[PDB]
Amino acid sequence: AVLTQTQIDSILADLAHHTDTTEHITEMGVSIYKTLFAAHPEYISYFSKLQGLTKDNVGQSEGIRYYGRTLGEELIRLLKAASNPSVLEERIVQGAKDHKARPVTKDQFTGAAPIFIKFFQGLLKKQEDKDAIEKFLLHVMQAIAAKM
Ligand code: HEM
Predict the structure, then answer these.
(1) Count of domains in the chain?
(2) 74 C-alpha to center of ligand 1: Å?
């Protein structure tokens, strides 16, 4: 549900070089999307700025960078908020607003959790942090879906 400050600090330390600049945070998000869209090319068309793109050219698009940055920034927001119940709930509310009335469904949203989790597990060094990010993202994405 929840992460301790120590856990957040450990996770952020590993992510520091992926998230230090706007360009890097954007590239981190694009990398998640490359994985998501390879697994679900039908999801490319869900995004207003990716209309017309396919699995063969989405990775090179300007549009994927727009979402890569929004996604990356929000993921770091969620992580930083993980030890503060009220701020985390604010982010979960924003999550629901971000995804309500969109082509993505509740089931597709929670169903994509393993893609995000496995991506982050790859970037983290300590097994305890790999375990932690899994618990956290599953919790967050279920909470967002429930409000949709
Ligand atoms: C915890 C994981 C996720 C986070 C933090 C997140 C974050 C965001 C953010 C910040 C936006 C707003 C972007 C904007 O300003 O337009 C957004 C929009 C959107 N997201 Fe996510 N997202 C997540 C997972 C997913 C998944 C799994 C999907 C499945 C396809 C998805 C699909 C969408 C769609 C369709 C929009 C609307 C895009 C548009 O046309 O403007 N998201 N998301």
Answers:
(1) 1
(2) 9
Question: Which structural domain, as residue segments, surrounds residue 64?
Answer: 1-148
CATH number, domain of 51, equals 1.10.490.10
Q: Which residue, 71, 70, 144, 54, is CA-closest to 107? A: 144
- Method of determination is X-ray
Q: Which atom of ligand 1 is nearest to the CA of 116?
A: 2
Rounded CA-CA distance 103/2 in Å is 29
Q: Which residue has the tokens 């590993």?
A: 14
Under 8 Å between Cβ of 76 and 25 = yes
The structure tokens listed for 104 are: 């993505």
Residue type, 103: P
Give this entry's resolution in angstroms. Answer: 1.8
Atom number of ligand 1 nearest to Cα 103? 35
- Closest C-alpha among 62, 55, 80 to residue 26: 62
Q: Do residues 14 and 125 make contact, with C-beta atoms less than 8 angstroms apart?
A: yes
